[PDB]
């Protein structure tokens, strides 16, 4: 439909805890915009915002939705996040793409922990925040109570903008303070009455109006003659002052609304359209190369694609935000990655579900295209002159993982296909195929996240899968040096296959001086360094073959045979464990036969000698250790330290700040297969953690003995 200038386009992302009456409020905006006819109810599951089958099946939103609402010369790009704790990826994508964040407060519950999580996310992403109160129709609500709760929760920089009078089911009016008005509605709701406030609330109205204008002046001093001295500049420049304060997060406004009764949603529309940071008036995004990318109509034609909703019967719709320039139907756009020079077609502006075709899209706006071929999530499409490969969006580390497998080992290709399709659906569904582990790894954000994926596989497509606990990457090694001796000769086949290998194994460190004397078994030996070569391992670790050939006792021409034997024994551990690392090998004695010396003899000799050397040496198992950064309030510091102590953890350091204390610990992955669920249960979901690999380390005797016993228990079947 009608094209809008970038100066009249705003991007808004709603944020709030579950059970906050937000998605409904979205239907309130859709109904009052006139784009839809009736105002549906989430109970009836007829809401336009909820169309994914799981989204109405669960009774709450699962994916973030994008939609447009039109008003007087202003159109708002409303993005409704799922609002749950385990759908962080949609929220962070919305924050990265949007311009401003909105927080909705439930009057019944007041400030909730999900509100804290969303506030932390937007603080990390540095976006403006406006507070809002929902559910004023519930008796279990007190505007003063939530006001003081938020006063004592965050800084004094915040300030309310409206003063509701009635409460609970009897709510039929409220007072606007920014514009100095009182609003009332019919019991049906929808038509505000701009009748002025009575003199009863005149005193408090003036008090909080003076407080608000003083706060706005402190946000930015406009130097106008009466601005901070006498009174505010009515309301016209108050919007600009509020926006400027929101630029630096110097003030967070507070609003109230009733979703069911539609109390003053028009007031919200007017306020949001009036005051909000502009698309250009915000800290501009950089590119991968670090060159500034200022959104402008006169700029080149580049597009970035983030959302790839694949809801059935509506097509593989792919949204996108216009980074710079414009876009027209029929244009040919280059693809930054796996470039194919995609030729575009009829574009559509979608209000969620139903979409409306549009002719031209300006920079800094969200559009949607269909029937694409080589466009995936995170891929960006650009013109010929504008080489951009935008990768400015970062997602939180996968806090949970599980191994997937269908009920029948006959649809592996279907697993790959649909799992990839879901990957694009939300990049958080990190899919990985560990070739060494022979398992397909799925990384999510929690138990409920994987439950959601399981439902989408089972019901949306009628596909059967199971979840199994992922395998653990174990690496073996040695600690005690030992002497390995072997002699080989086989006349049963062809040549004599003569072989004689004598070698010593030793754990390798970064700077050992490799001493030349080793008194083992009442026998000392002398080692002479002639050729030093280090061969690294692709699975990590290093191997060294400092030779000790006695003045040419064994020809170096056969050394690759010993090396091939060594790695052929090495790639399989003598016990359970994929490989071994940090092993220093010294070979001293050997014999050479003019006709019976051959490479296969040294193959077998090295293999068996190294196997029996590991048998003689002390085998040890190394468990991967992942650093954990728990961000938890002090009320559960004892519980978390006790749980970690029960999780064979090593305390590193406790950080102190505000009310949440950061924790550092070295923790084995073996007991972290379900750590996120336990942490969420203990802290009520009030804490998060970050995982990252550090260094393999040793394990106690009991766990390795159990692992070995299970290894032969499994092997006994074959």
Give residues in contact with ligand GTP (CB under 6 A). 16, 18-24, 42, 60-61, 82-83, 135, 137-138, 258-260
CB nearer to Mg ion: give 28 or 208.
Answer: 28
Nearest to 117 by CA among 665, 622, 660, 511: 660
> Is residue 551 marked as binding?
no
Task: Let me know: does 277 contact 240? Beta carbons within 8 Å.
Answer: no
Three-state secondary-structure class, residue 615: helix
CB of 681 to ligand GTP, least distance (A): 21
> Is residue 466 marked as binding?
no
Q: Which two tokens stand for residue 74?
A: 């202003």
Task: State how far the Cα of 388 lies from the Cα of 362, in Å rounded to an integer.
Answer: 18
CB of 82 to ligand GTP, least distance (A): 5
Tokens 């009466």 -> residue: 226
CB of 61 to Mg ion, least distance (A): 5
Task: Let me know: does 97 contact 306? Beta carbons within 8 Å.
Answer: yes
CB of 352 to ligand GTP, least distance (A): 12
* Contact partner, 135, from ligand GTP, Mg ion, none, Cβ < 5-8 Å per class: ligand GTP
CB of 298 to ligand GTP, least distance (A): 38
* Contact partner, 42, from Mg ion, ligand GTP, none, Cβ < 5-8 Å per class: ligand GTP
CB nearer to ligand GTP: give 141 or 672.
Answer: 141
Query: What is the chain's alpha carbon radius of gyration, rounded to the nearest angstrom?
Result: 33
CB nearer to ligand GTP: give 260 or 499.
Answer: 260
* Contact partner, 19, from ligand GTP, Mg ion, none, Cβ < 5-8 Å per class: ligand GTP
> Is residue 659 marked as binding?
no
> Is residue 459 marked as binding?
no
> Is residue 98 marked as binding?
no
CB of 24 to Mg ion, least distance (A): 6
CB nearer to ligand GTP: give 6 or 135.
Answer: 135
> Is residue 6 marked as binding?
no
* Residues ≥6 apart with Cβ < 8 Å to 248: 219
CB nearer to ligand GTP: give 64 or 318.
Answer: 64
Task: Let me know: does 441 contact 401? Beta carbons within 8 Å.
Answer: yes
Q: How far is CA 100 from CA 155, 267, 711, in A?
A: 19, 18, 55
- Chain residues that interact with Mg ion, rule: CB under 5 A: 22-23
The CA dihedral of 548, 554, 556, 560, to the nearest 10 degrees, is -90
CB nearer to ligand GTP: give 105 or 404.
Answer: 105
Residue 712 DSSP symbol:
H
CB of 471 to ligand GTP, least distance (A): 35
Task: State how far the Cα of 32 lies from the Cα of 27, in Å rounded to an integer.
Answer: 8
> Is residue 444 marked as binding?
no
Three-state secondary-structure class, residue 640: helix
Q: Which two tokens stand for residue 560?
A: 């690759």
CB nearer to ligand GTP: give 183 or 320.
Answer: 183
> Is residue 258 marked as binding?
yes
**What are the backbone angles phi and psi of residue 352, rounded to the nearest 5°?**
80, 130
CB nearer to ligand GTP: give 259 or 264.
Answer: 259
Tokens 């039929």 -> residue: 172
Q: Which residue is nearest to Mg ion (CB)?
A: 23
> Is residue 21 marked as binding?
yes
Which uninterrupted H or E stretch holds 108? none
Task: Let me know: does 225 contact 216? Beta carbons within 8 Å.
Answer: no
> Is residue 492 marked as binding?
no
Q: Which two tokens stand for residue 449?
A: 């996240």
CB of 81 to Mg ion, least distance (A): 9
* Contact partner, 18, from ligand GTP, Mg ion, none, Cβ < 5-8 Å per class: ligand GTP
Question: Which residue ranges are tagged as binding site for Mg(2+)?
Answer: 23, 61
Binding site per annotation, positions for GTP:
19-24, 61, 135, 137-138, 258, 260
């Amino acid at each position: 439909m009608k094209v809008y200038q970038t100066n009249e386009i705003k991007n808004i992302a709603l944020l709030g805890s579950s059970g906050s009456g937000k998605t409904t409020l979205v239907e309130a905006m859709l109904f009052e915009s006139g784009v839809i006819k009736r105002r549906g109810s989430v109970a009836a599951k007829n809401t336009v915002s909820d169309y994914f089958p799981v989204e109405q099946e669960y009774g709450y939103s699962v994916f973030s939705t994008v939609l447009h609402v039109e008003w007087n010369n202003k159109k708002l790009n409303i993005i409704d996040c799922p609002g749950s704790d385990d759908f962080v990826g949609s929220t962070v994508t919305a924050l990265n793409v949007t311009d401003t964040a909105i927080i909705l407060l439930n009057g019944q519950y007041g400030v909730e922990v999900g509100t804290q999580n969303h506030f932390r996310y937007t603080e990390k992403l540095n976006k403006p925040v406006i507070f809002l109160v929902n559910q004023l129709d519930n008796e279990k609500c007190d505007y003063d109570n939530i006001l003081e709760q938020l006063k004592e929760a965050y800084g004094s920089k915040v300030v309310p903008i409206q003063y509701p009078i009635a409460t609970g089911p009897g709510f039929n009016a409220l007072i606007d303070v920014l514009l100095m008005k009182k609003y009332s509605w019919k019991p049906e709701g929808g038509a505000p009455v701009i009748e002025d406030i009575p003199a009863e609330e005149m005193d408090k109205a003036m008090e909080m109006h003076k407080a608000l204008v003083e706060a706005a002046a402190e946000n930015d001093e406009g130097l106008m003659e009466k601005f901070f001295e006498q009174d505010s500049l009515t309301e016209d420049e108050m919007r600009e002052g509020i926006r400027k304060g929101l630029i630096a997060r110097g003030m967070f406004p507070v609003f109230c609304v009733c979703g069911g009764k539609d109390m003053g949603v028009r007031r919200l529309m007017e306020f949001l359209g009036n005051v909000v940071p502009f698309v250009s008036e915000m800290p501009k995004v950089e590119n991968t190369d670090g060159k500034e990318v200022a959104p402008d109509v006169n700029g080149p034609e580049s597009l970035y694609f983030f959302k790839t909703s694949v809801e059935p019967h509506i097509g593989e719709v792919s949204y996108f935000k216009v980074m710079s320039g414009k876009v027209r139907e029929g244009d040919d756009l280059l693809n930054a990655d796996r470039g194919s020079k995609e030729r575009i077609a009829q574009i559509y502006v979608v209000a969620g579900g139903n979409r409306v075709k549009v002719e031209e899209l300006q920079a800094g706006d969200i559009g949607a295209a269909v029937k694409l071929k080589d466009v995936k999530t995170g891929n960006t499409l650009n013109g010929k002159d504008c080489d951009y490969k935008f990768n400015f969006i970062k997602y939180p580390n996968s806090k949970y993982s599980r191994a997937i497998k269908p009920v029948n080992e006959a649809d592996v290709e279907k697993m790959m296909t649909i799992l990839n399709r879901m990957r694009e659906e939300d990049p958080t569904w990190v899919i990985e195929q560990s070739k060494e582990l022979k398992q397909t790894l799925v990384h999510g954000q929690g138990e409920f996240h994987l439950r959601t994926l399981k439902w989408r596989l089972e019901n949306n497509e009628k596909l059967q899968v199971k979840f199994e606990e992922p395998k653990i990457p174990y690496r073996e090694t040695i600690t005690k040096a030992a002497r390995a001796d072997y002699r080989h000769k086989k006349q049963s086949g062809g040549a004599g296959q003569f072989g004689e290998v004598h070698l010593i194994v030793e754990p390798y460190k970064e700077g050992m001086p490799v001493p030349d004397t080793y008194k083992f078994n009442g026998q000392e030996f002398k080692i002479t360094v002639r050729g030093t070569e280090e061969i690294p391992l692709e699975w990590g670790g290093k191997l060294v073959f400092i030779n000790s050939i006695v003045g040419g006792s064994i020809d170096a021409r056969f050394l690759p045979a010993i090396m091939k034997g060594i790695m052929s024994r090495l790639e399989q551990g003598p016990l359970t464990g994929s490989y071994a690392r940090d092993v220093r090998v010294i070979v001293y004695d050997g014999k050479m036969h003019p006709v019976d010396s051959n490479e296969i003899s040294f193959m077998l000799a090295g293999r068996n000698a190294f196997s029996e050397a590991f048998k003689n040496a002390g085998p040890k198992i190394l468990e991967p250790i992942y650093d954990v950064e728990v961000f938890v309030p002090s009320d559960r510091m004892g519980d978390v330290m006790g749980d970690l102590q029960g999780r064979r953890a090593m305390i590193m350091g406790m950080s102190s700040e505000k009310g949440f204390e950061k924790l550092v610990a070295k923790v084995p992955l073996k007991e972290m297969s379900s750590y996120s669920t336990a942490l969420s249960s203990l802290t009520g979901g009030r804490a998060s953690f970050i995982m990252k690999f550090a260094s393999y380390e040793l394990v106690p005797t009991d766990v390795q003995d159990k692992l070995i016993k299970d290894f032969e228990a499994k092997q006994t079947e074959e």
